[PDB]
Design a binder for this molecule. Structure first.
Ligand code: SF4
Ligand code: SF4
Ligand code: FCO
Ligand code: F3S
Ligand SMILES: [O-][O-]
Ligand SMILES: [Mg+2]
Ligand code: NI
Lengths: 262, 545
C-alpha cells in the first residue's frame, strides 16, 4: 500500500560476489528494484551511513513496524564465540541470530549462507556454518557461487508477491534448481556419444566435445545455467570449462578435484 | 574554504566501514579536529591459504577466486599465472591476450562501480540534488562535460522527480542516516553538481551490467569467471568473430560512459575539493605492472607490462627501481596470528590464526603487514600512475598532464586522497583508449590460429609466483608444490599492502599513514575518514583471505 516491503541484507563470511551478482539483475534493474519494489534498508556494500549511523539504520529496520525480510550473504564463523567475524564489535552469528528472530522470511543468497561455502571447506579453520545450521531455522536457499541474479531476484519477488516457492530437499526453489545443468547442456549429444575432451588443448576441446573427462559436475548439479545463462551472454561450459558444481552443498569438498571425476 | 575542521579531541571508531568490500573497523585518535593516530582493523578471517593445503594445484584458482567477488577474476588469474610458473608452462599468445582483455574489462567494471557506488556518496550530497534547478543543472553539465541526452534538463528533472518521490516516501533505504542528511560542512558541491552526479550514479547502475556482460563474453560469467586453465584458456568461442564484435560493441558503450560521465564527474568533484590534494598522501609506491606483451614468466611480466612495474620510494619520481620479488615479506606482529611469523617471504609464508580481543593495540587486524625492504608500500591506481608517469609512458604522461592542467595543480598534488581518487579515473580512461587495439590484436590472432592452451606436466616438486596488477594494485600468489600437491600457497593482496596493520617495526601502513592529518568537520559524521579510506578502494576479503 505505497509502503515498499523492507529488506535487511547482512554480510557475514563472504566475498561479496553475491552482492555483485544481485546487482547484475535486468528484470528489473537494481535501481528499479530498490526505488519501486523493495525498501533495501541495510546493505553495507552500497549504503551511505557508516559506523554507528549504519548500525542505527540496521536497528531502525529491525524495529520497523511493518517487519522486514532478511537476506543473508556469507557463512557464519563460529570459532572463539563468533569473534573471527565481527561487525560493529559484535559477532556475525549474534547479529544474524537477532535479525532472523523477527524476520518474515530468510533468503540465503549464495552457497556460503545456504551451506557454509568456501570458508567451510576443510579444514574449516573458522568453524564456519550455513545459516540454517547456525540458527536452526529453515531458510530459502539461492545457492551458486554466486547464484544467477535471475534466481535471487526471482525468489525475492516471489516471496513478496506470492509467498514461499516450492523448495527442493536442500531448500532450493524448484523454479530455478529443479533441473540438472547436464540435462540442458548443448554438449549432451557428445556425452551420449562418449565424445569427451581429454585435455583443454586437444582438438576435441576445440570441437566442443563434452567436458566430463575433465571433471564437469554438470551431471550432479542442479542449476539453470545453460537455460538462462549469465550476463545474457555466456556460461562456463559454453566457455569451454567444466561445471564445478558450485550450487551443491559443500561442493568445495564433494566436487573436488575439480578437474577429475575421482 | 578553508577546510572545515572541528575542535574535537578524542577517539573515533567507524565500524562498519560501508561502501567497501568486506569488514573493516577504523580507529583514530583526533586532537583539535585532526587525526593524530590511526589503526586499520580488519574484522573477518576465512583462511583460504589454510584450506588450500594438500589440494590439487589445479583447484587453487577456483578457491582463490573466492577471495573476493568484487575484484572477481583477478585471483583466478594470479593463481593460473602462479601454477603456470610452477609447472614451467608458457601460455599461447591468444591465452595471454584473452587473460589480459578480461583484466581490462575488470578494470572498467571495477573502477566505475567504485567511483559512483562506493566513493561518490562521500563527496556528493544526494538530498541536496532536490534543491537543484534542472535547467541550471543542464547548463552547468554542458560546461563541465561532453554533450549527451542524459544530461538534458528533461533527463535531470526525471531523476530529480524519481529521487523526490523516493525521499518523500519516508523510506530512505540506502540513504538512511547518511552523513550528508541535513547538510554537512565537509560537503562542498552545489546542488546542481549533486543532481548531475546522482543522475550518473543511476546510469552507472545500468552501465556496470554491460561492463560485466562484456567480461562474461570472454570469462564465461560474472561474477567469478570460468575460462582459465593451467596452460592458458578454455574459451575457444572467445576467439571468434561475433562474440568479439559484441565484446567490442559493449566495451565501446562502457568507454563512452567513462569519458562522458566518469572522468568529467571526477574532475568536477576534484575541482571543488582541491584542498584534498593536501590530505592523505603517502610516500612509497609499488606495481607489478599489467597488460604485458610477454607473460612467459614473472620476469617478463615485470619487464613488458604496458602499465609498467616499478618501485618509488620517498615520492622520488626520478628513481623508479625494478621490482625485487625476493625483498617482499609479511609481518604479523600487530596481526591476529601466532608469534614468530614476522619477516616471511611468501614462499615461506605462514598462516596461523590467533585472535586476541577487539581494539587490542598489539594485535588489531586479520591482515598481515606486507613490507618491501622494511617499507610499507602503496599499491593501486596511484602507484601505477606515478610509476608510469615517472617512466614517461606516453598515455599516462598525456592524461596526468590533462588532469594537472584542468585542476591547475603540480604533480606533487597527486600524493593525496584527491590524487588517489583521480589516478583511478586516469587509468580507466587509458584502459578504454587501448581496448579496440587489444581486441583487434586478439581477433586477428585467433582468426589465424586458435591455439589457447599449452601442454604441460605436473612436477613432483616445485614453486611459482603469479603476479598481476589488479584494479587495487600489486597482487601475488605464491605456491610450493610437493608430492604434486599444494605444500604452501600464500596470497599477498593489494589491500593487504594498503590496509594492513603496522609492520614489525611499528610502522603504519599506507592507509594508517594517509589518515594522519585528516581534518574532522563533524566528529558525529566523519566523512573525511571515509574519503581517505574509500580512496584506497579497500577489499577486506582480498586483504585477509
Ligand atoms: S557463495 Fe560464492 S560468490 Fe557468494 S559470497 Fe560465497 S564465495 Fe562469494
Ligand atoms: S559438458 Fe558437462 S554438463 Fe555438458 S554434457 Fe558434458 S558432462 Fe554434461
Ligand atoms: N583489485 C583487487 Fe582485490 C584487492 N585488494 C585483489 O587482488
Ligand atoms: S560451476 Fe556453477 S554457475 Fe552453473 S555451470 Fe556449474 S553450477
Ligand atoms: O577488490 O579487491
Ligand atoms: Mg596471505
Ligand atoms: Ni577484492
Amino acid at each position: 500500500a505505497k509502503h515498499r516491503p523492507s529488506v535487511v541484507w547482512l554480510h557475514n563470511a563472504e566475498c561479496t560476489g553475491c552482492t555483485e551478482a544481485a546487482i547484475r539483475t535486468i528484470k528489473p534493474y537494481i535501481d528499479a528494484l530498490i526505488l519501486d519494489t523493495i525498501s533495501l534498508d541495510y546493505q553495507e556494500t552500497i549504503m551511505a551511513a557508516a559506523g554507528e549511523a549504519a548500525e542505527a539504520a540496521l536497528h531502525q529496520a529491525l524495529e520497523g513496524k511493518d517487519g522486514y525480510y532478511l537476506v543473508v550473504e556469507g557463512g557464519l564463523p563460529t570459532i572463539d564465540g563468533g569473534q573471527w567475524g565481527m561487525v560493529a564489535g559484535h559477532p556475525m552469528i549474534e547479529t544474524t541470530k537477532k535479525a532472523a528472530a523477527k524476520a518474515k522470511g530468510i533468503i540465503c543468497i549464495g552457497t556460503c549462507s545456504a551451506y557454509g561455502g568456501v570458508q567451510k571447506a576443510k579444514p574449516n579453520p573458522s568453524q564456519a556454518k550455513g545459516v540454517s545450521e547456525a540458527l536452526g531455522v529453515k531458510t530459502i536457499n539461492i545457492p551458486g557461487c554466486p547464484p544467477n541474479p535471475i534466481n535471487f531476484v526471482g525468489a525475492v519477488v516471489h516471496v513478496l508477491t506470492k509467498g514461499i516457492p516450492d523448495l527442493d530437499e536442500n531448500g532450493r526453489p524448484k523454479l530455478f534448481y529443479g533441473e540438472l545443468v547436464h540435462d540442458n547442456c548443448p554438449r549432451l549429444p557428445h556425452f551420449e556419444a562418449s565424445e569427451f575432451a581429454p585435455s583443454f588443448d586437444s582438438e576435441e576441446a576445440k570441437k566442443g566435445f563434452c567436458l566430463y573427462e575433465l571433471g564437469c559436475k554438470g551431471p550432479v548439479t542442479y542449476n539453470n545455467c545453460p537455460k538462462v545463462l549469465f550476463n545474457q551472454v555466456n556460461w562456463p561450459v559454453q566457455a569451454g570449462h567444466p561445471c564445478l558444481g558450485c550450487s551443491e552443498p559443500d561442493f568445495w569438498d564433494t566436487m573436488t578435484p575439480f578437474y577429475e571425476q575421482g | 574554504k578553508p577546510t572545515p575542521q572541528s575542535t574535537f579531541t578524542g577517539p573515533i571508531v567507524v565500524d562498519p566501514i560501508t561502501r567497501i568490500e568486506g569488514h573493516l573497523r577504523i580507529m583514530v585518535e583526533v586532537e583539535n579536529g585532526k587525526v593524530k593516530d590511526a589503526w586499520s582493523s580488519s574484522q573477518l578471517f576465512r583462511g583460504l591459504e589454510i584450506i588450500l593445503k594438500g589440494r590439487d594445484p589445479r583447484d587453487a584458482q577456483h578457491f582463490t577466486q573466492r577471495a573476493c567477488g568484487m575484484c572477481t577474476y583477478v585471483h583466478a588469474l594470479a593463481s593460473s599465472r602462479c601454477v603456470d610458473d610452477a609447472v614451467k608452462v608458457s601460455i599461447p599468445a591468444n591465452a595471454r591476450m584473452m587473460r589480459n582483455l578480461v583484466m581490462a574489462s575488470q578494470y572498467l567494471h571495477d573502477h566505475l562501480v567504485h567511483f559512483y557506488h562506493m566513493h561518490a556518496l562521500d563527496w556528493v550530497d544526494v538530498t541536496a540534488a532536490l534543491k537543484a534547478d534542472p535547467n541550471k543543472a543542464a547548463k552547468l553539465a554542458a560546461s563541465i562535460a561532453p554533450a549527451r541526452p542524459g544530461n538534458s534538463a528533461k533527463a535531470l528533472k526525471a531523476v530529480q522527480d524519481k529521487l523526490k518521490a523516493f525521499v518523500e516516501s519516508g523510506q530512505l533505504g540506502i540513504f538512511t542516516n547518511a552523513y550528508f542528511l541535513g547538510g554537512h560542512k565537509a560537503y562542498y558541491l552545489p546542488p546542481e553538481v549533486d543532481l548531475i552526479a546522482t543522475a550518473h550514479y543511476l546510469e552507472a547502475l545500468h552501465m556496470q551490467v554491460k561492463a560485466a556482460s562484456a567480461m562474461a563474453i570472454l570469462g564465461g560469467k560474472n561474477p567469478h569467471t570460468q575460462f582459465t586453465v593451467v596452460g592458458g584458456c578454455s574459451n575457444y568461442q572467445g576467439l571468434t568473430k561475433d562474440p568479439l564484435a559484441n565484446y567490442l560493441a559493449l566495451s565501446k558503450e562502457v568507454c563512452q560512459f567513462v569519458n562522458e560521465c566518469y572522468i568529467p564527474d571526477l574532475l568536477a568533484v576534484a575541482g571543488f575539493y582541491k584542498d584534498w590534494g593536501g590530505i592523505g598522501g603517502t610516500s612509497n609506491y609499488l606495481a607489478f605492472g599489467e597488460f604485458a606483451t610477454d607473460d612467459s614468466s614473472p620476469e617478463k611480466h615485470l619487464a613488458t607490462s604496458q602499465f609498467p612495474s616499478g618501485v618509488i620510494t620517498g615520492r622520488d619520481l626520478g628513481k623508479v627501481d625494478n621490482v625485487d620479488l625476493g625483498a617482499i615479506y609479511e609481518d604479523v606482529k600487530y596481526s591476529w596470528y601466532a608469534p614468530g611469523g614476522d619477516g616471511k617471504h611468501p614462499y615461506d609464508g605462514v598462516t596461523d590464526p590467533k585472535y586476541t580481543k577487539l581494539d587490542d593495540k598489539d594485535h588489531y587486524s586479520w591482515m598481515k603487514a606486507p613490507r618491501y625492504k622494511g617499507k610499507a608500500m602503496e599499491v593501486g591506481p596511484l602507484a601505477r600512475t606515478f610509476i608510469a608517469y615517472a617512466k614517461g609512458q606516453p598515455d599516462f604522461k598525456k592524461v596526468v598532464d590533462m588532469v594537472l592542467g584542468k585542476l591547475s595543480v603540480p604533480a606533487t598534488a597527486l600524493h593525496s586522497t584527491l590524487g588517489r581518487t583521480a589516478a583511478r579515473g586516469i587509468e580507466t580512461a587509458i584502459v578504454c583508449a587501448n581496448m579496440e587495439k587489444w581486441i583487434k590484436e586478439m581477433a586477428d590472432s585467433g582468426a589465424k590460429d586458435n591455439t589457447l592452451c599449452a601442454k604441460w606436466e605436473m612436477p613432483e616438486e616445485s614453486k611459482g609466483v603469479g603476479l598481476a596488477d589488479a584494479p587495487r594494485g600489486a597482487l601475488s600468489h605464491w605456491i610450493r608444490i610437493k608430492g604434486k600437491k599444494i605444500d604452501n600457497f600464500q596470497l599477498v593482496v593489494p589491500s593487504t599492502w594498503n590496509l594492513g596493520p603496522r609492520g614489525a617495526q611499528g610502522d603504519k601502513s599506507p592507509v594508517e599513514e594517509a589518515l594522519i592529518g585528516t581534518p574532522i568537520a563533524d566528529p558525529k559524521r566523519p566523512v573525511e575518514i571515509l574519503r581517505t579510506v574509500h580512496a584506497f578502494d579497500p577489499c577486506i576479503a582480498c586483504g585477509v583471505h
